[PDB]
Swiss-Prot record, chains A, B:
A Pfam family matched in the record: GFP
Organism expressing this protein natively: Entacmaea quadricolor (Bubble-tip anemone)
Chain's role: Pigment protein.
Biotechnology: Fluorescent proteins have become a useful and ubiquitous tool for making chimeric proteins, where they function as a fluorescent protein tag. Typically they tolerate N- and C-terminal fusion to a broad variety of proteins. They have been expressed in most known cell types and are used as a noninvasive fluorescent marker in living cells and organisms. They enable a wide range of applications where they have functioned as a cell lineage tracer, reporter of gene expression, or as a measure of protein-protein interactions.
Source taxonomy: Eukaryota, Metazoa, Cnidaria, Anthozoa, Hexacorallia
Family classification: Belongs to the GFP family.
GO biological process terms, semicolon-separated: bioluminescence
Regions annotated as coiled coil: none
Name by which UniProt lists this protein: Red fluorescent protein eqFP611
Amino acid sequence: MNSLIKENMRMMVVMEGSVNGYQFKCTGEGDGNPYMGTQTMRIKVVEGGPLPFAFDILATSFSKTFIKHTKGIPDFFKQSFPEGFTWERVTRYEDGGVFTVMQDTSLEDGCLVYHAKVRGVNFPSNGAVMQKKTKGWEPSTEMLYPADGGLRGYSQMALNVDGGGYLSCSFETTYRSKKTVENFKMPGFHFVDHRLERLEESDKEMFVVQHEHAVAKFCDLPSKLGRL
Amino acid sequence: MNSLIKENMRMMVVMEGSVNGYQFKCTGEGDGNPYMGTQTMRIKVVEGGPLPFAFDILATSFSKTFIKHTKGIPDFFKQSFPEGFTWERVTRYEDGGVFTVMQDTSLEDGCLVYHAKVRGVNFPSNGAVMQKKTKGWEPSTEMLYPADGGLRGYSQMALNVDGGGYLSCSFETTYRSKKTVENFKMPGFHFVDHRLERLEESDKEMFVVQHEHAVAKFCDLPSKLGRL
């Protein structure tokens, strides 16, 4: 903990926007070990609650600082402080849904601060999300590589649905530090394994507890060309 | 090797179709250890060669039998024989390209037989592919889960390009056994790590040697809900 990003950190989060025309607002706080890549957060729907859609769709919008890093993979997010960073992302659901996010990450008074403006549209009325018939996400692997001076991430996720099925979705993310380009050491192509799980929920999902574990790493498989 | 799929197997491949209006035809053969998940193949462009596009785009179209499996993950492909299986896939490149494939997998005379009909369109004339300025693919992780009686796979890949950049692409695959549904044991949601590398190439890419290593597995990260 001898630095800006300490062994243990806390975070604050303010989310707002709409989904399928419905306005809402969320607030949350938590902590974790940025170096072990572990995270836990408590969130409350302070407005528009109870949401007419599944909270799951908002899961990945509520913390890149908390990602474990091995040797050989420079930390894009950690190197970004005190300034912080931002990122934009578009998620597309196979059944029609589109979820766009704009987030700001800063560090105020030793605490991490998250502001995310979100907009969702086209979620089928008889869809698992709007019908709130979802049951958490499966883990996933994010693919990342340097692009346009920033960091690009590509994601593919499967959301469990009532009955035993899955609802597919993919997204591309763009992460950008607020620090000079010739300052930090940009990482190369790599992956990040994620496992975001819902711990608790009550009051028609008006209060939510979630957890995430993420680890940066290279492909396990051996290369014949001596490539990473 | 005491069964249909032996410790060591060979394979035959006949590819044909077009890309951006250009017709071509490829033939190839190889072998590998289906259980160690290793593969090597030699391919020749018997028609339309030299191709006016990068061979890389055809890489993932040339062998699901060769995938290592741990305990807990039933083998969808191996369980499919002697009958065999098929699969369909659509790849979409971020710059406009679309590559559709239809493949048949059979087992004739102890040898694996591949027939794949492919169609590509919309590859930008000043694109890395048509300009043949690509430099192999990076490894990737395929996401898979049961759907509509068959197996669905989702993929995200990055193709290296001249200069130091990457060209993105994703695809969804549908795999279907030719054996009864109540016969084999359908696997659940899981992943497959892939690392497809180009070994050799000559004669303006008219002859190509490639290798693949694939392993089925569950997410490495621990779950708090006791989920796989």
